Design a binder for these strands. Structure first.
Ligand SMILES: [Zn+2]
Ligand SMILES: [Zn+2]
Ligand SMILES: [Zn+2]
Ligand SMILES: [Zn+2]
Length: 117
DNA sequence: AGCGTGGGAGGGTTA
DNA sequence: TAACCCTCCCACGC
């Protein structure tokens, strides 16, 4: 399954790719060489992709646009869940007894599940 | 309730 | 040999 296993004592985390393991290894070492050099910000990241995603907050760039209402979004995963507001898709159904409510996002189902109990 | 929108994280592809 | 792009998990706020 996962041939790349973390060698840190007690971690026991395994990965499919070596790049995934080397990316995880910075969690133990704590190195965050990708600092944000914008003013009034001290955010640091161990990954370059997380820094550039964060720096969209400073630049205001929204590269992902909804083809229905033309609204732009900073992140592609948030455009995907926004599209369900137009299509009405709710792929996450509550499995509580007698309940039939469905939700477009998983965190909405988790919040609804916590309301049952 | 429904949904915008961050960080943290793991999947993938690519010279 | 990591940068790059993707969605998910979890969280916070209105
Ligand atoms: Zn580890
Ligand atoms: Zn910043
Ligand atoms: Zn839209
Ligand atoms: Zn329910």
């Amino acid at each position: 399954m996962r041939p790349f296993m973390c060698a840190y004592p007690g971690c026991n985390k395994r990965y499919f790719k070596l790049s995934h393991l080397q990316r995880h290894s910075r969690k133990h070492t704590g190195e965050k060489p990708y600092q944000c050099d914008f003013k009034d910000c001290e955010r640091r990241f161990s990954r370059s992709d997380q820094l550039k995603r964060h720096q969209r907050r400073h630049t205001g760039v929204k590269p992902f646009q909804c083809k229905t209402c033309q609204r732009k979004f900073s992140r592609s995963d948030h455009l995907k869940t926004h599209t369900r507001t137009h299509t009405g898709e709710k792929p996450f159904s509550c499995r509580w007894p007698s309940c039939q409510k469905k939700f477009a996002r998983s965190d909405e189902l988790v919040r609804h599940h916590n309301m049952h109990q």
